Every structure is written in C-alpha cells, then in structure tokens.
Write a protein that binds this DNA or RNA. Structure first.
Ligand SMILES: [Mg+2]
Ligand SMILES: [Mg+2]
Ligand SMILES: [Mg+2]
Ligand SMILES: [Mg+2]
Ligand SMILES: [Mg+2]
Ligand SMILES: [Mg+2]
Ligand SMILES: [Mg+2]
Ligand SMILES: [Mg+2]
Ligand SMILES: [Mg+2]
Ligand SMILES: [Mg+2]
Ligand SMILES: [Mg+2]
Ligand SMILES: [Mg+2]
Ligand SMILES: [Mg+2]
Ligand SMILES: [Mg+2]
Ligand SMILES: [Mg+2]
Ligand SMILES: [Mg+2]
Ligand SMILES: [Mg+2]
Ligand SMILES: [Mg+2]
Ligand SMILES: [Mg+2]
Ligand SMILES: [Mg+2]
Ligand SMILES: [Mg+2]
Ligand SMILES: [Mg+2]
Lengths: 134, 144, 182, 60
RNA sequence: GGAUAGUGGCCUACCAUGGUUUCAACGGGUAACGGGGAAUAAGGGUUCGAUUCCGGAGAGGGAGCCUGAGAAACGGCUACCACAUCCAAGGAAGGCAGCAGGCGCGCAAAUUACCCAAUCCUAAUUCAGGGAGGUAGUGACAAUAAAUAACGAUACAGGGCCCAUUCGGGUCUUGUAAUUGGAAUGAGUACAAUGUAAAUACCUUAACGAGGAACAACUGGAGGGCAAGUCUGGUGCCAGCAGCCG
C-alpha cells in the first residue's frame, strides 16, 4: 500500500537548453517525502533516460501530507546536464565534487595582501630578509 | 448674515482669519511655538533619566490630609531639577539617595494630579530596575 | 531595500468597551459557537462592515451603471459562493441585511457540528484543531475556514486520521503494546 | 498612645499587614474553555433571576 | 565682448535707473529635505511623511583641481580650520551619514556570522567580482491564523413534568462534585527525507512525548464614569489609592 505514483505536469520541451521541463506532482499516501534520488531514478526509467540526465528540486510536501510538488528537468544527454546545470546540483547528485575553496573572509584578506605588493613578491621577500639581516 | 465673508473669491480672508484664530487654542499654540522643547523639563520626551538629589515628602491639599512621598531629581539630559512622585505603599525605601531614576509623565498632560502640589512626574524605574518589579519582589535592587 | 508586502489589520475593537448588552451578546455568540476569544466576533463584524461599506457605496451609485453592475454582482456571487447569502435574495439590498451570525454560521466549526461527525461545538473545535477534518482530501486545522457551498459536501475525517481509517494513535497504540506485552 | 510608632514611615501599613498565603487553587480552564464556562454559568445556568444577574453575590 | 557645451548680468566695459511689495514682497523661525503616501474617517477635514519608490543634497566644515563622455568625486588628490594616529622625533598617514562592531549621547534601535544559490550590476566579459543583494543571528515595532483540553459512565443538583393521593418514580432534559473510564492531540525532543550554495527553520514523518493532563496565562480592575463585592482580616483622614468626582 506504498505505491509512490508520479506525474509530470506542464511539461515543455526546450532544445534551447536540450531539456524537458516539468512540475513534479508525486502522490504518496502513508509515507513521508520521496527522497529525491529515488524519484530521480523513477523519472529516469519513466522518460527512458539515465539517472544522470535527470534533476529534481524545489520540492514541497503539501499541508497534511500525501501529495508533494517540485520542479524537474530531463536533459537529452548526460554531457548536456554536466555542461548546463549549476555546480551545486552536480554536487548533490555526486556527478561533481565540492570545490576546495577557502572561506570568503580569508580570500578577501589575501586579496588585500596581494594589493599591498606591486608586482610579484619574489624580489621583496629576499630584499626584506637581507634588510633585517643588517 | 454671518460674521465671516461668503463670496466665491473670499478664500484669502477666510484662510487668514482661521490662521489668526488658531492661536486661541492651547494645543496649537504649544505645537507651533515649540514651548515643549524650550521650556518644559523634557523637550517632547515621554521619559527621562535623572539623579536623586534629596528625599522629601510634600503635604497634600485641604480635603486630603497626608504627606505624599516624593523625591527631588536633577535631570541628566539638560540639568533641570524637578520633583517626582514614587507611586506605591512601600516604594520610598526602595529608591536610595544618589541613584539613577527614570521619571515618566504623571498622566495629566504635564499638570499636577489630584491632591499633590507642585509635582508633575512619576517614577517608573530606579537603578535600571522598575519599581513595580521591586514592589512585588519579582526583582531586587542591584545596589551598585 | 525590497518591496514590502502589506500587512493589514482584520478587526476593530468597539468604541464603548463596557456596554452591558453588547458584552452579553458577545458572550452569547462566543458560547454558541465555541469562539476562543471575543476578537473573533470583532473580526466577523469587521468583515461585515467592509462588505457593507462596499454595498452602500454601490447602492449610492445610479442603477444600471457599469460599476454598479460589475462590482455588485461580483460581491453577490462571492457571498452566495461563501453561502451566507441565500440564492433567494441575490439583490444587493438584502446584502446589507446580513448579520454577524450569518458569517459565524459558515465557519468550518459550525459546519462540522451540523454534519454530525462532531456532536459538540467544542468537540468540533478540538477535532478541527487535531488535524482530523479534511475539506476534500486536504486537512484543515483551522476552525473558521469560511466553508463554501460548492465544497461542503466533501467534509469528512482525513485518511491519516484514525477516524478516517489509520493507526489509532499514541494512547491506543501504547495500551495495545502494553496489553500484548502483558 | 495617640500614635503607636513614628508617623509616616514610608510603607507602614504594608510592613505590618499579616502575610496570608495563597490557597491551593485547582487549575482554572483557560482559553475557549473559560468562555464556555462563562456562557454556561450565565445563559444556561441562570442562578438568580430575581433582581439583576448579580454575578459575585456576596453572602449575607 | 569674455567664458560657457550652449541661452542667460554668468563675468567684464560703457550706458539707462530700474526690479519686488498689503494678492504679504524683504526679514525672522522651522526639534522643514520635496513628493508618491500614513494615521485618522458620515461629509468637510486635522496631524504626520528621517525611512523599502522617484527626485535633491552631503561625505568632519570649508574651498581648489587632475583623469573622463560623465566628479568640483571624497572607499580620487591639494591646502586651511577642527579632531586625531605611528614615530627611531627626521618624517609618514587620516576620513563609517557603506556592511559589521566600539565609545559617547540619550527613554529610545541588531551578529566583527554564511554565501554569490535568487534579483541584478560591473568588466576584456558565461566562468572573475560585488557587506548591492540574498541567508541566517537578535528582534513582543507592527501584522495573520490560532494550543492551554474534548467525550463518556457515576454521586449533588436544576428546569418541560403523568398528574398534583404528601409522595413520587425523573417518567424528558441541563448543570455541580479533589469522584472515575476510554480516547485524540500537539508544545517539545528525534531516525530520516524534503528544504538550502551549505545549513537552520517551516511542510511531511519514524521512535518517544498528558492526568493535578505541575506541559499550572497573564495584565488591570471590582463607589461612579465603566462590566464586576456595601464578603473576611489589617491600617485608622496614617499608610496609601485616586486620569476626574472622591
Ligand atoms: Mg500634613
Ligand atoms: Mg533640518
Ligand atoms: Mg521623506
Ligand atoms: Mg516634510
Ligand atoms: Mg532630522
Ligand atoms: Mg533615495
Ligand atoms: Mg557628492
Ligand atoms: Mg561623522
Ligand atoms: Mg571612461
Ligand atoms: Mg568634496
Ligand atoms: Mg567611507
Ligand atoms: Mg561613493
Ligand atoms: Mg587617491
Ligand atoms: Mg555602522
Ligand atoms: Mg545592506
Ligand atoms: Mg527599540
Ligand atoms: Mg528569538
Ligand atoms: Mg501554559
Ligand atoms: Mg489578579
Ligand atoms: Mg487596586
Ligand atoms: Mg480590594
Ligand atoms: Mg457597574
């Protein structure tokens, strides 16, 4: 009596982005939300596409449980999904990796520190070293 | 038929007559002259802090025989000195000498209320804490 | 700076706060329909007053005037859709004759009481507040809800609720577990 | 004598009043229940129809 | 004529002696930025509008200027005044009415937080950047919906009563009792998943989570105005209350 059933309303093709856009209306009684990865797979074999060229987001389980609604897209190829989707969706789905970024404050600190020096700092480092030498 | 002019081109004198008559009111004259900012102990201020100078009680009027327990407070914002009234049974002892006290209006539009002569200000807070919390022993004076 | 969205008051406390007859009538209406506060009657009176200001303004306008037609029949269709104004008196002159009790009557509280699934008005209030009644498969935990004519036929206990058919709940499940264990 | 102690002692009456403790006071229903209780007590359990309603009728 | 990008006493040279004003000119005050608007509401109006949008002005007060298409710019320079900083006493460097935060002031107002996800903007231009902005933190400024119990079975009762042999069954119902039962449910915690740039939080939901359901609602008032006591004790024109009468 689980029978998670899925529907794609307002589906529009879009070769401008080589995609198919729709709103995901998922009916699921006696159950919590649909755990996106599982519904991505469901749309994958629903539209005859790989689990990589399918994306869902913006979900909202309506008041009182049961129905839930989100937005979904099906890309023509996995490469197009790679080259068109935002980085954070490619991180959610495991097809990309979080970029090793320093925090914003440290980046700004380093930007100002680079501002302090005109040109490469190769000369000034040795100059200062031999300066405090004497 | 009436003192005011009635012609269709008599807007000027009607307007200036109303403008000259408006000064007969007290609220309008106070608002336009700005007497509250210049002469009142607070300038358009509902509340004001101050420092207790001494600890006096004033007798009441004729039909009411008692001594209301007030306190003389020098205002910190400008330096004026005003008497203020501590409102409750056992709140005089709560306020001590030379402590910051937050005075408020007395509720009668800056005029003496009831039988208490020459006072126009309540006492709401003492030393950062309120009188009402002290009177019901909900908070205690920090004694600093 | 982002464009604000306008909050607005929805009630208006009366001028004379200690009218004996008015206070007794307010308590009568609060006890008849299980209203939590007397702000509820103020809110219904404010809604009635807005409707009534619109009605009188449209009445002032001349008969067979586009504003009169359009907005008057819009207001009448909205009120008959709500259900407070009976189909007999769609005239915009009986719309002034509506009373606060009429809008009180269309509350989901009183509707659940009328249908009989709640045998008491306060029982209707709690049953609504416990997420049991669903107006067309949609759970409504809100007593007023201004139940409309077209959807009153679809009030029943929700499927997720034990009354509509589900697991009983905390007390009964715990007692069943205790009985099974001992 | 004329005055038992020093006069005008900044809270004399409050100081010398007997401190009487609160009663145990079983919980009073609150919210919609209070309004239901008032409605029952006034408009379906009419007690003293003679004279006025006389809510809080002092015993004498 | 000069200058202006250009008209123009905008400036200069020479002339004329003119221009505004009781329809309030000029001067003074504004705890005055103007407006779209806000509160208030029979109609007419009164007050407010520093602030989410449009304009104007300002970057401590003043003046002066380079670069450019656009600045009299100030997170651009020059100098004076005021206020200051490091100092090896020769010198050097200042501009929060930007986002944070601090001192002071005052009755009076927030975290040195996350990030470019969304709105956009700048650039050589997708990609870089953006305290613009969004997200969270505090937040009872205001605004919306709304929990704090609901229903039985019993004892103490009240009204429509079959009549009225006193009755009285309670025949028909409605309350009051520390009696007494079975239910439902959140406020909280919390597997998860959704949410989000990542997280909270909300919507959903496992597993817990109500008996004095201590998971305990206060704030004011009870002479009148004004709804509710001429109950009990205390003080005795004291203490105090009282917006006014008292
Ligand atoms: Mg005396
Ligand atoms: Mg100014
Ligand atoms: Mg403005
Ligand atoms: Mg203004
Ligand atoms: Mg100002
Ligand atoms: Mg602006
Ligand atoms: Mg400027
Ligand atoms: Mg400054
Ligand atoms: Mg340029
Ligand atoms: Mg400048
Ligand atoms: Mg700056
Ligand atoms: Mg700037
Ligand atoms: Mg510079
Ligand atoms: Mg700041
Ligand atoms: Mg900002
Ligand atoms: Mg504040
Ligand atoms: Mg908080
Ligand atoms: Mg509580
Ligand atoms: Mg009380
Ligand atoms: Mg009192
Ligand atoms: Mg009393
Ligand atoms: Mg009365």
């Amino acid at each position: 009596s689980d029978a998670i059933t899925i529907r794609t309303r307002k589906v529009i093709s879009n070769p401008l982005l080589a995609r198919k856009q729709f709103v995901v209306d998922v009916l699921h009684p006696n159950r919590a939300n649909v755990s996106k990865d599982e519904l991505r797979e469901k749309l994958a074999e629903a539209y005859k596409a790989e689990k990589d060229a399918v994306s869902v987001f913006g979900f909202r389980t309506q008041y009182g449980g049961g129905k839930s609604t989100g937005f979904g897209l099906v890309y023509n190829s996995v490469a197009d999904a790679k080259k068109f989707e935002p980085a954070y969706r490619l991180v959610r789905y495991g097809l990309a990796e979080k970029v090793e970024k320093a925090s914003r404050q440290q980046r700004k600190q380093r930007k100002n520190r680079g501002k302090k020096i005109f040109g490469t700092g190769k000369s000034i480092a040795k100059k200062a070293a031999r300066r405090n030498a004497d | 038929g009436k003192g005011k002019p009635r012609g269709l081109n008599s807007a000027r004198k009607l307007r200036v007559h109303r403008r000259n008559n408006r000064w007969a009111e007290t609220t309008y004259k106070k608002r336009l002259l700005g007497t509250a900012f210049k002469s009142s102990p607070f300038g358009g201020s509902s509340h004001a802090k101050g420092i207790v100078l001494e600890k006096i009680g004033i007798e009441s009027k004729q039909p009411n025989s008692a001594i209301r327990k007030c306190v003389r407070v020098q205002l910190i914002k400008n330096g004026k000195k005003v008497t203020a009234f501590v409102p409750n049974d056992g709140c005089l002892n709560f306020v001590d000498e030379n402590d910051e006290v937050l005075l408020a209006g007395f509720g009668r539009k800056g005029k003496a209320k009831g039988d208490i002569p020459g006072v126009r200000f309540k006492v709401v807070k003492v030393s950062g804490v309120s009188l009402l919390a002290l009177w019901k022993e909900k908070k205690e004076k920090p004694r600093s | 700076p982002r464009a604000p969205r306008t909050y607005s008051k929805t009630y208006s406390t009366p001028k004379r706060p200690y009218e004996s007859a008015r206070l007794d009538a307010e308590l009568k209406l609060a006890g008849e329909y299980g209203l939590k506060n007397k702000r509820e009657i103020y809110r219904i009176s404010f809604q009635l007053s807005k409707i009534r200001r619109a009605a009188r303004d449209l009445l002032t306008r001349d008969e067979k005037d586009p504003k009169r037609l359009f907005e008057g029949n819009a207001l009448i269709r909205r009120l008959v859709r709500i259900g407070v104004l009976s189909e007999d008196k769609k005239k915009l002159d009986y719309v002034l004759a509506l009373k606060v009790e009429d809008f009180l009557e269309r509350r989901l509280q009183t509707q659940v009481y009328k249908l009989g699934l709640a045998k008491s008005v306060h029982h209707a209030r709690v049953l609504i507040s416990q997420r049991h009644i669903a107006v067309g498969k949609q759970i409504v935990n809100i007593p007023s809800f201004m139940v409309r004519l077209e959807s009153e036929k679809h009030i029943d206990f929700a499927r997720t609720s034990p009354f509509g058919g589900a697991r009983p709940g905390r007390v009964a499940r715990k007692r069943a577990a205790a009985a099974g264990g001992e | 004598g004329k005055v038992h102690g020093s006069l005008a002692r900044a809270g004399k009456v409050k100081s010398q009043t007997p401190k009487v403790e609160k009663q145990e006071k079983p919980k009073q229903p609150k919210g919609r229940a209070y309004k239901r209780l008032l409605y029952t007590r006034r408009f379906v359990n009419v007690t003293l129809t003679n004279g006025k309603r006389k809510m809080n009728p002092s015993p004498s």
